[PDB]
Every structure is written in structure tokens, then in C-alpha cells.
Design a protein around this ligand. Structure first.
Ligand SMILES: Nc1nc2c(ncn2[C@@H]2O[C@H](COP(=O)(O)OP(=O)(O)OP(=O)(O)O)[C@@H](O)[C@H]2O)c(=O)[nH]1
Ligand SMILES: Nc1nc2c(ncn2[C@@H]2O[C@H](COP(=O)(O)OP(=O)(O)O)[C@@H](O)[C@H]2O)c(=O)[nH]1
Ligand SMILES: Nc1nc2c(ncn2[C@@H]2O[C@H](COP(=O)(O)OP(=O)(O)O)[C@@H](O)[C@H]2O)c(=O)[nH]1
Ligand SMILES: [Mg+2]
Lengths: 52, 58, 426, 436, 97, 95, 434
């Protein structure tokens, strides 16, 4: 980078992602998406329980 | 042998890195990526989402 | 030495060329993976005419595929003998003309033709001494007819002295796929009479007729028609690809069949074509070849030459054959039906012999006879073009695209005086 | 090659709900979004690219927008089986309906729904790359279909213009009907359907009732069966884009080969063999008889008689085990027969197209597994007949000025009633001179 | 054949704090070489025995990063040591007197 | 020497004798270009290299050194994808 | 004997130089840790052009990094083949100019350039016979453009007789990163027309176009762009480093390509570049080299040479090739496409051959054309510059520093007179004099 450089320019994990053209185009972490959807539903249920 | 004519059944040229049917995997050259209907040919597609970063390509 | 650069335009052009390259590759023994596996040395010495040595016995065809829709290209690389072309030679548009000569000649050619000319220029200056270019296309569709004629025009302005073949399929009224057939066929022929060196006329009506009567098939798919036109193209170019007792190249046949610079539309007939059930009950002799070749039902056009005069004719024979019988049979057919041959040209028959037959055969023939019955089909097309243009059917699909009506008046006037001069020399 | 389909109206969403059920079943997609776990990557996959995109991982969200003003039918979609198929936003829903009112749907509520819809369409096209065209589904009888449907097509033609817009509209039937203000609605919709849709295909409901009563012998058909075979027709004329054929015909060919004059785009449709699970086993299906079967008025999707008309042109989509030989032989027999007559401007009045994949079947459908099928889209002067039939009974009610106060209350006047009526008269003169 | 298979090199840490602690401090982590560590197979007790084991039939050299071999320069290829051809036996005519 | 604490370095090696079975990797600590002069810490070998000509098969040797100086050495034969890991003062693991 | 010192400026320059030193070290066989382990003796005999023997086969590059933020320097250090550079040659500031040519030429350069000059002097007298200085930088940024050009000026005042190459990428409006790109590029080119001996013009637009069409890569990253540029530079200086049947030094190429002291902006190209899937289909002959070398889509500038005239051209070849084939190919190209070559200079093609190929191939080629199509790009920049300078936009960031508007007026004057000179020399007559 122009300011700070922590990572290598040939680091394997970064290269494995960038090279996977599908991952660049669309990327998801489905597990975390499930967990966050359940977190939202649980917060709504907590609100309704408090009102009850 | 009768050859199918006209368009339909997207093939080795229209296949590209980013579309809605092309499978996951590492590919450096577009013409190499362009033949997965040739390379893979009958795996279950759970395996393609499993092996996200792996060659298994021409 | 002498080279042939192949050019395919349109969907029908691509399927025709796919089968053509299939049989030529089989003739020269190169396998669908692209390597030489022949046995005779004679196959190896004359493949610069159609190929280029790449690496380790890899020969890629000297062709340029050209169209406007990717499904044709996918169909090219799907079938066998599909991975032998070079991907750079797949010069290729992205929008699609779709039965529109105007789109095929003014709007899309403007951005496609520069890349095609770049590719074809590269393919020409690759080899040393071109013999001629070859073009297969259609006269019904848009990207075949329109882009084809624009390519022909641009090429003939660039490389004037080089020869040029054009295999055009003209639509027939009995076998009518599209509706704008006249509006395309008439405009294309207008461009074709002034730019192409010579042309050979095909039509699917006669092809279905031949596969019906001679070959005796239930299901004549397009592959078999492609097989017939392929065997024709191979028969035309056999004299370059193989030694023979009497040779005849493209230029030699051109000068010996074109007496006037506007009369260069030929009809074609191939023989032998026999059903495999009747394949054993027949002899193999040059009278057996000439009885089927000069048969009027064997022509590959919807123009019966018995309704007109055989202006000139030519026959290309394959196989180690007897020149005496060859010439004597031509002499006899010339002298017997003396009314069908023109008067002011004695010895109306050019003949040639190349001793290498197609694989699976021992003796074959190819006929290219310039008759005056071809103006029958041009009149048959011109009257439909008049029937539509008389009160402007479908006209806006070209008018709003850049054209004027004077292009249509030109097209019909050039159709008019062409069929008139053909009627004159009859 | 991508094509996005928009549905405007309570009939539009019901037709869409049948089309997309058929599309997911034709490409093997489960209703919950993604393909079966057992599915194996193979040639012929990616066939679904022209209707679905692929989000995230294993999720296919269609290229469609249902849009209605009453939230009822949109909420039925949001709670049905295909909860997880459509993206939540793609189903645009208003707050209150137009209620059989072209005026209310064109000037009152459309003015606030149209910006959200076309902002959605633009980022659907921006996600797309090789856009073939849009295709619209609507019934012209209602208010949402007609009114803001016209408003949408207006601004679509302004936004893009050159791109093809296939309009599969549903006209009201002559004798069987569900509304009263529908003549006003149909006329005021048509005046904008003239200069905006590139191709328009008419679909009447009585004709389909006749078909399902006679052929499929279903004595009590609901709208589902009607929606079922309409989606069958849409699938049959998009299969050329989707799957490889021997000689296939695109979207962009119809405009070239069926529109002889820039104001005449109204095309009768038909389908055959519309057949049941028992008659199909008993009767042998071949190309010649079904090419005949697609030509009587007893098998058309519009209640009109082309025997009174002259066929301007014809397009024939073939699906299944069909070779170019016999389809050519069949159109030869039709052209040489004289029970129907072609116009003088067209000696070559046909355009055939052949595709390989047989049309699929659906659980709950009535058609069995058939080997080959025909979908015809022709053009004739019988449409110039049906517009006059509709016009006469529009003048009936407009003479006594019935229901006029509704539209005036919405803010319109008598001027556009007069001009819409005159435009229909002009088009009537247009059809009678072309047929000459 | 991924480009990461041919990737040779020696990476280093990027930007970081100043060290501020010398290696002589007990809390400063240091690399100690001895004990010897996990030897593989029997009879490798001594370093010289390790060398004999390494020399018998195992051995390794680093691969040529260039794919092809180095082409002989045109000078060397064109001018190799050569030997002149043998003359042959001469005739001698007897002089006459 | 003088490389910072978190440091990795990989190289590609090959056999020198044609048709070789094993390849013996030795880990040496020192500065002398002669090998016998440096001190030795750990050695292992990649076994069952498939038969091949002189310099065809590929072995990847990569040294990794962590923050509190623990050193690991990964040897990876590419053809059969044989991975062996060597840890300072701890057993050799296969993979 | 003949020596080339390397000077890298800015972040883009630094990454390019890193890839370039990687490829050169690979070509000469020295490992990333800096010791020799090659095979042939042809590797040892000409590494004095780039390195110095330190201690027992230890070779350090003859380079000088130059920038203003430690991110670039530590990206250099963290990379492989990164432990070979001498840290005393890491002359380096820590403020950052930030895409400001005035900052890179008046504020921070004014005190960093003296230390940079000390280092470059030291590394230039560390050798015997300087062939040239070789400066790699960009024309958009500030720490590369401004400081680099001030360094060029000072060096041309100090050592006037030695050669000077400048690899400069230029901003293109299609792929334009920053907003002050014209303000920087115009002043930079104003300095380069008066100081640099020759400048080789690159641009990321043409680089991306090449990587898309010819290579057909899926993800053409800056590493691949830098690899292309590095291969170009290596092909330039292969003639000094390896014996050939026809040598061509840098001064030789310059005197054969520069007809007038101000027309020294060259467009470059490399050959062969084919995809891994399409390499099976292609033929491998000198015709297959030149047909791709002279191709318009292979030039590494956004200027179609078909739009003008080739003033001069040069082709360097690597690999064992037949000079007869080489010469007849050059002859065919010059004779057939005859109108693209200027008239008042016959035999417009300088050519040379060397016997050592780049790694991975047996045979390759590098093209340096001095065309008159470069005024296309210069006008394309000058129009944006004058559009902005019509209303003193973004101008305070330079005005409040010490610069005036007269500097911009002079920049515009020199740029427009340069393109006018190019146009006159393009449309000049064949034979007549006054
Ligand atoms: N063919 C067919 N037509 C339908 C179907 N459902 C409704 N229609 C037609 O829709 C027309 C009226 O419009 P609707 O869809 O009912 O309602 P709308 O289009 O939203 O108009 P509004 O009720 O004013 O909002 C009637 O002519 C019906 O014939 C259907 O499932 N199939
Ligand atoms: N022999 C042959 N004729 C064909 C083929 N495909 C189409 N045709 C005929 O050519 C005409 C249509 O050509 P078309 O497909 O429109 O060409 P294009 O669209 O311009 O590429 C019709 O008359 C068809 O009968 C084919 O594969 N072989
Ligand atoms: N080829 C290449 N170009 C680069 C790279 N990084 C930046 N650039 C180009 O450099 C231009 C900006 O120059 P800049 O980085 O600001 O130069 P500097 O800040 O003075 O060092 C942009 O147009 C980029 O396209 C790189 O890694 N490789
Ligand atoms: Mg409603």
C-alpha cells in the first residue's frame, strides 16, 4: 500500500481468493448469515416478550 | 451426426468467469476455465461448493 | 504453395463449414484431436493448401468463422472436429442481425468488419502466395447475406487479383423458412453479380429432392445436406490437393466456364449418390457415372437445365481412370442431346482427372455446368420481390435502418437486366 | 442472453405464478430456491442463466417483477410455496388498488408506483449483460393492468426505446365477461398499446375455456388451468433462447418476420397438441396432424374466426422429436390447401422454428408427457374484426355517457375519450386497407 | 499447475514497532538450537552418519527456475574443434633416362 | 540470519539421480558453505518418490519461524502430494 | 564494464522495480537470499552490469528506491527477492506528498533530493564505466512524478554525457485513478522534454487491453502488469548482458531511433504473449513473432500507430535465430505496409539479435517504435489540462506552495509546441529544401 504494508504481495490465502473469480464476483459466509438472521428473530421475540 | 444449430445451450465461448452457471474454482486463464462441461462432467455440485479453492481444471 | 483461405458467414454457413472441415480433415487423415495419423505420404505434401503446421504435427485449418450469435460457435466447438480450430479465428459479433439485411450491411458490419478484416488479413499474410479465398454463406438470413456481401465487397477492393469462390444457398419457394427471403436474396445477388468472381448455386429444395429419390432416406437431417455440399466443395478443390493426370485449379475452371464477366452463377451435380441398399446392385464405370451426372434430376439447384441451354459445362473426375473413356463419354453426351448445348461455342465441356478418390470410393465425379436455366430461379425470386415491394410490405425494417427505396429499385433493375441478358444468350 | 419478465395486474401475477412454477420445474430448481442436493454438474447446466441469476451460493432469484396495487395477491405470493424463490423487493405492492379504473390507475396511483418500479427494472437490467428484451404480462380489463401498465410502457419506451417489449395481453371476451367498465378500460389501454409494445399477442379467456372444455375435457376449469397452458405457450416460444435446437428462432425475429407495418402488431396464438393423459396414449401424435390441429379456430387462444380473415404471416415453433423434413412437408400441404387463404403480399407467409427439448409436465397439470408440440403465432385481419366488435359496444355505453363521471372525477376529460375512440377508428381503417 | 507451486522466496515481517528490547533479556524470545531434535529413522545418531546416509543414494539439488536448458551460444556451437581431412596417396612417375 | 521473528521461506528442489526412491532433507544451523562444518538439527526424508528422469519431480521445502522462535519445516512432494511436517523438539508428523 | 544504475520512484515505480529485479535475478540465477546458484558461466560474466560481488557469491543490486511513505518500502522488503537490496540505498522520507506534483517538486523534494543524490552518486561511482541511468516512475502521482523529475533534472546537470532511460506510465482518461492527473502529467512532460534522453511511454489502459485480449487472463492484477513491464525492460537490456550475433547498446539504440533531440517518446511492445489454452494451436516461427510484434493491439500505449507514421522502429530479438529470416521479415514489413513509414528516412528499422532467451521460452522479441502517433495521447492530456486551467480549478493546492500560473502557461506552451513539431514532422515533404 501507499501507507502501511502488513500483507505479502504473493500471500497464498489472499491469492486463492482473488484468483477464484467466482468468489470475487459473489461472496458469502452462509453460516454467519444464518446466525445473524436468527439473532434478528430472537431480538424481535425478546421485544414481544417484554411487551407481554 | 446432426449438429444443433443456432443459439441456446451456452458453450465453451460464452462461458466466462462471472455468470450464473459457472462453478467455483481457481482459474487463471479464461480458455482454461471455459471447459468445465468438458473437465468435470458429472460430479455432484455439493463438491464444487465444498472445494472452493482447488484446481481440478484444465 | 497455392493457398485457400476459408470464410464462413452465418448460421447455415457455420454448419456447412463444420461438415466441410470434417470431410477434408478425414481426407488428409488428421484426427479430431488435430494430429496427423495418415499412411500415404501423398496426404502430407499438400496440406499447406488448407492448414498450417503448429507444433508436433498439429495442423489448424486456414478458416475464419464469422457470425453474430454465440450458439453457432458453441455448436461448432461441441461436435467432433471442433477443437481443431484456432480460437482467434472465431471472429464474432454480439448483438445479432436476425433476418435483417440492413442490420447485416449497415449497422453491425460497421463495428464487426474491422476485426474480420484484421483476422483475414492476418490469415492471408501468413501464407506466401494465395490462390483464392473461399466463402460459404446463405442468402436467406441476415448475418450471412448482409455481412457476407459486405465482406466480399471489402475483400475484392483490397485483394483484387486473387480468386474467389462463393457457395450461396438461395431459398426456394417450396421450402421457405423465412418471410423476408426475397428482400435479402435480391439485394445480395445485386452485390454478388458485381463483386464475386464466380458462384455456385445451392438450394435446399433440390437437396431434399436428391436425398429423397437417390439416397432413399426417411429422415434427411441437415447433416446429410451438409454432407452433400461438403462432397461438392471437396470435389472442386481436389485438383490442388492431389496430383492428377490432368489438373484444373480454380483459375483454370473459372476462365473455362465464364465467357462473360456477369455470367458466373453455376449449378452443381455430384455423383455417385446411391442408396446403400442399391449400393451392391450397380457397376462402377464411367457411363454409370455420366448417366447420373447429366441426369437433370441430379442438379443441386431448382433450375432444370432441360428448359434451357447448357452454355458451358465442366466435369472433375476422381480416381485412377481412363482418360479415353472419360473424353469419349463427354463426346457422346455432347453429340447426342445436341439441342441442349449452345451453338456458337463448340466443345462446351471442360474435363479434368485427379487420380485420388474420396475415402470409401474408387471413382467419383463433380459437375459444374453454367446453364441459362439459372434465370428461371432468379425470375422466381424477382417476382416475389416485386409482389412485396409493389406496396411496401415489411419495408420499414430496412427504411428506418439507413436505407432508401432507391436501393430496392437498383436491386430489381439489376435483377431485371441480368435475367434479360441470360435470356438473350439463350 | 437474458430476458426479464414483468407482470402488471392481478392477472399478471397469477400468470407469472404459473410461468415461474413451470420454469423452476423445467430447469430442475426446487421451489425453495436451489437445485436438489443430488444434482451433478454436467453439460446442459447453466441453461437457467436466461431467467435466473445465481446469488451467494446455491440460490437462484428470477429476473422478474410482479407488481400490483392491492397487497392481497402479492401477500399470497409472499406466503405461498415460493416464499424463498422471489427476492422480497421484486414483488412491488401498492397500498390501494385502482379498482377497475384506467384513470385512477394512470394518473392517481401510478404516478407514485412507476418510479419505484422502473428504478427496480434499471438495476435488474444493470445486473443483466446481454438483454434480449423485456416481456410484459397484463390484462387490459382491470385498472392496474391497463392504467399504470400503459404508464410503465410509456416510460419504458422513453428509457430504452429500441429494445423489444413482448406484450402478452389478455383482452376481455365478447360474450363472457367479468366487468362493466372494461370497454372504456380496453380502449384507453389500446391507444397506448399501439405505439409502445413492439409485439402484442392477444389472449382471450373464453377461447381457452373452449379449449379446456373440448380438448382437455375438464368440465370445471378454474384460472389455474388457464394460467397453466398460457405458461406452456410462453415456455414454448422462449425455448429457442434456452436450449439448443436444429433451427431456432429468437425474440428479435418476430418483429422482423411478423410485423409488416409498424402499427400492426397484434398476433393470434394457438397451441397443439393440447391433450389429456388418456387420449394421448390412444392417438399417435405426428407432425402433420398437429400442424393441422394448430389451425382451426377450435384450438386458438383468441375467440375469433380467421376463416373470415386472411393470414398475413405465420410463425411456427416446434418442440420435441421433429425433423425439418416433415414440418416442411406439412407447411407445404397447408400452403397448397384452399380452406385458408394467404394475403397477396406474402407468398412465403411462414417462418418455422425447431427445438429439441420436449415440453415438460407439471404435477397438478392436465397435459401428459408428449413427444412433440406446436405453438403458432400468426397475424390476420380477424383482429381488425375483434377491435370493431369491441368498439361497437364501447360506443353503446359512451353514447349515454354511462360511468363517465368516474374518470372525470379522477381528473380526466372527454378529449381523450374522443381521441381514443378515433384512434380505434383509424386502426380499423388501417386493418381493412391492409387486408385489401 | 498453480503459480504458487513455483513461488520461491524468503518473506519478512512488514511494518511493526521498534524493537525496544535486546535479545539478552529473559522475556525476549530466542531460538535455541540444542537439543538436536527429532531425527528420522534408525542409526542417525551422529552428524557424520547423517552425512553418509545423505550421500548414499538420496540427494537433492534445487530445480532450475528456467523451464528449458540454457542454449549453447552461437559462437561455441558454430566453431567446435575440427580436424583436417587426410590427404591421400600421391602418384610418383619414374623419371626416364 | 537477521530476518525478523515471523518469517517464512520456501524453495523448490528436485532429485539429482535419475530413478531415485527417497530424498533426504537435512536441516543445518551455521554459516559455513561447507555442510559438514555447520551443526545439525533434525533430518528427515521424503519416501516413495515415483520413478522419473533426472530433475523432473518437485519437492517443496518451506521453513516457517514463529514469534517465540519455534521452527517448523514442511516438505511437500507435489506429484503424489505427500506432506511431511517436522517440528523442533517434537515428533515428525505425516499428512 | 558497461553499467546501468536503477532508480525507482514512487509506489507504482517501486512495485514495477520489484518485479523487474525479481525477473532479472531469476535470469541471472541468484537465489532470493542473494547467493549465486546458477548453472552456466554465461550467467557470471555480465552481472557486473547490475550487481556488486559482496562476500562469497553475494550480489547486491545497483538500485535506489525513492518514495515518501514506509508502506511501499516495506512492501518491497516483505516480497521475495526482497532481502537483496542494500538498506543504505533505501533513501527515504516519511511525510508523503499525496498526488501533489508541487509537493513532490518544491516542498519535500527540496530536502530529500540531496540525500537521494548522495546515494545515487555513491552508487554511480561504485562502478567504472557508466552506460546509463534507468529511471522507472509514473506520471500521475506526486512522489514519483515530481521528485523523479527533479532528480532527472539534477542528474542531467551533474552527469551530462551518460545515457538516460525513463520508463513512464502516463494517465489515460479511460482508466484514470486520481483527479489531478493532468496537472501532474503536463508539468512532468514539460520537464522530460528538456531533460530525459529517452522516455518509453506505457499506460495501464493498453496494459489491461493486452491482458484481456491476448493473454486472456481472468484477473489481470498489477502483478501481471508489472510482469509485462519488467519483461519489456529485460528485453531492452538483454544486449548488454548476453553475447549476441548483433549487439545493440542503449546509446546505439538511441542514436538509431532519435532523429531530433526532442522527439524521444517511444511506444513499446513485447512478443510472444499467448494463452495457455491457445498456445497449442499456434505456430512458432519468426513470422509468428513479427506478425504479433507489429500488431496494433500489442503496442503498450493508447495510441494506434495506424493513425500516423512510424518515424523509426527497432526490434530486439532473443534466442538463436537466423539473421536471414530476421532481415527478410523486417524487409517484408517495411515494404508492404509502406505508407505507415515516413518517406524522408529510408530503411526505418534497426534490428538486433542475442542468443539468450528470457525464462520459459526459446525465443522472443521486443519492439520500440518512435512513431508520430504519440501526439494523440499528448493532445488527449493537454485538452483536459486546458479545460481545468480555464478556471483555476484545484489550483490553490499548487499556488499556495510557491508555484505560480506562469509555470502552467509554460507547460501548456511546451506541450502544444511539441505536438506541433510532431505534426509538422509527420506531414513533412519528401524531397525539397530551403
Ligand atoms: N386469463 C386469465 N385472466 C385473468 C386471470 N385472473 C384475472 N383475469 C382477468 O383480469 C381481468 C381484471 O383484472 P384483474 O387482474 O382481475 O384485476 P387488476 O388487473 O389488478 O385490475 P383491478 O382489479 O382494477 O386492480 C379480468 O378480465 C379477468 O378476466 C387469470 O388467472 N387468467
Ligand atoms: N443446407 C443448410 N441450409 C440451412 C441450414 N440452416 C439454415 N438453412 C437454410 O438457410 C436459410 C436460413 O439461413 P439463416 O439461418 O437465417 O442464416 P443466418 O441467420 O444469416 O446465419 C433457410 O432457408 C434455411 O432453410 C443448414 O444448416 N444447412
Ligand atoms: N502498473 C502499475 N501501475 C500502478 C500500480 N499502482 C498504481 N499504479 C498507477 O499509478 C497511477 C497513480 O500513480 P501514483 O501511484 O499516485 O504514483 P506515486 O504516488 O507518485 O508513487 C495510477 O493511475 C495507477 O494506475 C502498480 O502496482 N502497477
Ligand atoms: Mg385488480
Amino acid at each position: 500500500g501507499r501507507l502501511v504494508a502488513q500483507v505479502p504481495n504473493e500471500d497464498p490465502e489472499r491469492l486463492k481468493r482473488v484468483l477464484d473469480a467466482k468468489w470475487r464476483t459473489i461472496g458469502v459466509d452462509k453460516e454467519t448469515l444464518e446466525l445473524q438472521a436468527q439473532e434478528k428473530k430472537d431480538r424481535e421475540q425478546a421485544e414481544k416478550d417484554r411487551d407481554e | 451426426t446432426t449438429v444443433a444449430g443456432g443459439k441456446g445451450a451456452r458453450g465453451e465461448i460464452t462461458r466466462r468467469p462471472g455468470e450464473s452457471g459457472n462453478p467455483y474454482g481457481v482459474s487463471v486463464f479464461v480458455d482454461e476455465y471455459g471447459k468445465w462441461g468438458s473437465a468435470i462432467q458429472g460430479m455432484p455440485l455439493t463438491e464444487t461448493r465444498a472445494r472452493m479453492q482447488t484446481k481440478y481444471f484444465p | 504453395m497455392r493457398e485457400i483461405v476459408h470464410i464462413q458467414g452465418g448460421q447455415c454457413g457455420n454448419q456447412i463449414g463444420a461438415k466441410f472441415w470434417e470431410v477434408v480433415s478425414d481426407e488428409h487423415g488428421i484426427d479430431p484431436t488435430g494430429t496427423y495419423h495418415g499412411d500415404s505420404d501423398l496426404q502430407l505434401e499438400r496440406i499447406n493448401v488448407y492448414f498450417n503446421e503448429a507444433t508436433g504435427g498439429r495442423y489448424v485449418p486456414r478458416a475464419i468463422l464469422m457470425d453474430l450469435e454465440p450458439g453457432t460457435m458453441d455448436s461448432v466447438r461441441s461436435g467432433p472436429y471442433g477443437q481443431i480450430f484456432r480460437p482467434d479465428n472465431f471472429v464474432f459479433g454480439q448483438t445479432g442481425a436476425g433476418n435483417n439485411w440492413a442490420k447485416g450491411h449497415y449497422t453491425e458490419g460497421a463495428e464487426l468488419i474491422d476485426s474480420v478484416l484484421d483476422v483475414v488479413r492476418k490469415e492471408a499474410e501468413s501464407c506466401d502466395c494465395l490462390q483464392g479465398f473461399q466463402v460459404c454463406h446463405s442468402l436467406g438470413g441476415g448475418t450471412g447475406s448482409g455481412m457476407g456481401t459486405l465482406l466480399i465487397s471489402k475483400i475484392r477492393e483490397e485483394y483484387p487479383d486473387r480468386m474467389m469462390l462463393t457457395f450461396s444457398v438461395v431459398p426456394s419457394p417450396k421450402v421457405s423458412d423465412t418471410v423476408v427471403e426475397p428482400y435479402n436474396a435480391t439485394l445480395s445477388v445485386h452485390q454478388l453479380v458485381e463483386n464475386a468472381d464466380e458462384c455456385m448455386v445451392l438450394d435446399n429444395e433440390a437437396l431434399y429432392d436428391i436425398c429423397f429419390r437417390t439416397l432413399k432416406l426417411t429422415t434427411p437431417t441437415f447433416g446429410d445436406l451438409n454432407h452433400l455440399i461438403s462432397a461438392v466443395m471437396s470435389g472442386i478443390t481436389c485438383c490442388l490437393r492431389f496430383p492428377g493426370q490432368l489438373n484444373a485449379d480454380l483459375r483454370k475452371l473459372a476462365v473455362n466456364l465464364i465467357p462473360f464477366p456477369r455470367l458466373h452463377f453455376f449449378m452443381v451435380g455430384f455423383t455417385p449418390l446411391t442408396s446403400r441398399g442399391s449400393q451392391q446392385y450397380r457397376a462402377l464405370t464411367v457411363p454409370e457415372l455420366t448417366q447420373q451426372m447429366w441426369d437433370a434430376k441430379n442438379m443441386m439447384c431448382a433450375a432444370d437445365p432441360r428448359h434451357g441451354r447448357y452454355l458451358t459445362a465442366s466435369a472433375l473426375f476422381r480416381g485412377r481412370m481412363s482418360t479415353k473413356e472419360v473424353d469419349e463419354q463427354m463426346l457422346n453426351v455432347q453429340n447426342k442431346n445436341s439441342s441442349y448445348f449452345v451453338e456458337w461455342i463448340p466443345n462446351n465441356v471442360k474435363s479434368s482427372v485427379c487420380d485420388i478418390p474420396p475415402k470409401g470410393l474408387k471413382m467419383s465425379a463433380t459437375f459444374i455446368g453454367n446453364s441459362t436455366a439459372i434465370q428461371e430461379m432468379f425470375k422466381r425470386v424477382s417476382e416475389q420481390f416485386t409482389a412485396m415491394f409493389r406496396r411496401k410490405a415489411f419495408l420499414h425494417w430496412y427504411t428506418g435502418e439507413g436505407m432508401d427505396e432507391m436501393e430496392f429499385t437498383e436491386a430489381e433493375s439489376n435483377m431485371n437486366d441480368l435475367v434479360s441478358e441470360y435470356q438473350q444468350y439463350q | 442472453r437474458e430476458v426479464i419478465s414483468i407482470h402488471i395486474g392481478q392477472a399478471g401475477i397469477q400468470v407469472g405464478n404459473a410461468c415461474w412454477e413451470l420454469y423452476c420445474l423445467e430447469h430442475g430448481i426446487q421451489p425453495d430456491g436451489q437445485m436438489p442436493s443430488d444434482k451433478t454438474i454436467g453439460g446442459g447446466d447453466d441453461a437457467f442463466n436466461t431467467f435466473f441469476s445465481e446469488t451467494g451460493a446455491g440460490k437462484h432469484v428470477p429476473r422478474c417483477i410482479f407488481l400490483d396495487l392491492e397487497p392481497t395477491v402479492v401477500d399470497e405470493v409472499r406466503t405461498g410455496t415460493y416464499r424463498q424463490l422471489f427476492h422480497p423487493e421484486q414483488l412491488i405492492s401498492g397500498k390501494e388498488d385502482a379498482a377497475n379504473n384506467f384513470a385512477r390507475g394512470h394518473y392517481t396511483i401510478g404516478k407514485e408506483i412507476v418510479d419505484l418500479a422502473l428504478d427496480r427494472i434499471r438495476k435488474l437490467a444493470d445486473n443483466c449483460t446481454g438483454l434480449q428484451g423485456f416481456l410484459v404480462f397484463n390484462a387490459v380489463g382491470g385498472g392496474t393492468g391497463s392504467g399504470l401498465g400503459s404508464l410503465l410502457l410509456e416510460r419504458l419506451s422513453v428509457d430504452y426505446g429500441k429494445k423489444s417489449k413482448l406484450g402478452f395481453t389478455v383482452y376481455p371476451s365478447p360474450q363472457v365477461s367479468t366487468a362493466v367498465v372494461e370497454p372504456y378500460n380496453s380502449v384507453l389501454s389500446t391507444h397506448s398499446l399501439l405505439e409502445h409494445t413492439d409485439v402484442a399477442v392477444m389472449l382471450d379467456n373464453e377461447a381457452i375455456y373452449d379449449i379446456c372444455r373440448r380438448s382437455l375435457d375438464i368440465e370445471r376449469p378454474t384460472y389455474t388451468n388457464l394460467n397453466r397452458l398460457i405458461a406452456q405457450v410462453i415456455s414454448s416460444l422462449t425455448a429457442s433462447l434456452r436450449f439448443d435446437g436444429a433451427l431456432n428462432v429468437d425474440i428479435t425475429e418476430f418483429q422482423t418476420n411478423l410485423v409488416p407495418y409498424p402499427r400492426i402488431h397484434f398476433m393470434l396464438s394457438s397451441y397443439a397438441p393440447i391433450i389429456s393423459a388418456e387420449k394421448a396414449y390412444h392417438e399417435q401424435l405426428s407432425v402433420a396432424e398437429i400442424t393441422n390441429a394448430a389451425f382451426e379456430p377450435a384450438s386458438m387462444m383468441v375467440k375469433c374466426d380467421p376463416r373470415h380473415g386472411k393470414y398475413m404471416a405465420c410463425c411456427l415453433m416446434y418442440r420435441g422429436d421433429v425433423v425439418p423434413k416433415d414440418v416442411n412437408a406439412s407447411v407445404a400441404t397447408i400452403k397448397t390447401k384452399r380452406t385458408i387463404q394467404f394475403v397477396d403480399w406474402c407468398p412465403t407467409g411462414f417462418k418455422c422454428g425447431i427445438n429439441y427439448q420436449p415440453p415438460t409436465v407439471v404435477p397438478g397439470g392436465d397435459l401428459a408427457k408428449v413427444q412433440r408440440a406446436v405453438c403458432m403465432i400468426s397475424n390476420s385481419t380477424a383482429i381488425g374484426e375483434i377491435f370493431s366488435r369491441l368498439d361497437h359496444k364501447f360506443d353503446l355505453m359512451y353514447a349515454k355517457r354511462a360511468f363517465v363521471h368516474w374518470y372525470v372525477g379522477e381528473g380526466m376529460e372527454e378529449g381523450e375519450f374522443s381521441e381514443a375512440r378515433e384512434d380505434l377508428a383509424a386502426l380499423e381503417k388501417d386493418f381493412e386497407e391492409v387486408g385489401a | 499447475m498453480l503459480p504458487t507451486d513455483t513461488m520461491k522466496g524468503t518473506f519478512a515481517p512488514g511494518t511493526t514497532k521498534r524493537k525496544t528490547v535486546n535479545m539478552y533479556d529473559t522475556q525476549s524470545s530466542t531460538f535455541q538450537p540444542r537439543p538436536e531434535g527429532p531425527f528420522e529413522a534408525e542409526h542417525i545418531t551422529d552428524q557424520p552418519a547423517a552425512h553418509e546416509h545423505f550421500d548414499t543414494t538420496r540427494e537433492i539439488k534445487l530445480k532450475d527456475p528456467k523451464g528449458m536448458d540454457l542454449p549453447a551460444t552461437s559462437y561455441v556451437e558454430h566453431y567446435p574443434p575440427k580436424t583436417a581431412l587426410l590427404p591421400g596417396e600421391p602418384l610418383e612417375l619414374a623419371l626416364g633416362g | 540470519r537477521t530476518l525478523d521473528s515471523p518469517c517464512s521461506a520456501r524453495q523448490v528442489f528436485t532429485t539429482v539421480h535419475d530413478n531415485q526412491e527417497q530424498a533426504c532433507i537435512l536441516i543445518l544451523y551455521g554459516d559455513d558453505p561447507v555442510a559438514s562444518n555447520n551443526t545439525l538439527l533434525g533430518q528427515f526424508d521424503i519416501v516413495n518418490i515415483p520413478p522419473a528422469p533426472k530433475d523432473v519431480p518437485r519437492i517443496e521445502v518451506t521453513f516457517h519461524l514463529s514469534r517465540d522462535m519455534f521452527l517448523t519445516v514442511e516438505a511437500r512432494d507435489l506429484d503424489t502430494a505427500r506432506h511431511k511436517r517436522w517440528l523442533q523438539r517434537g515428533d515428525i508428523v505425516v499428512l
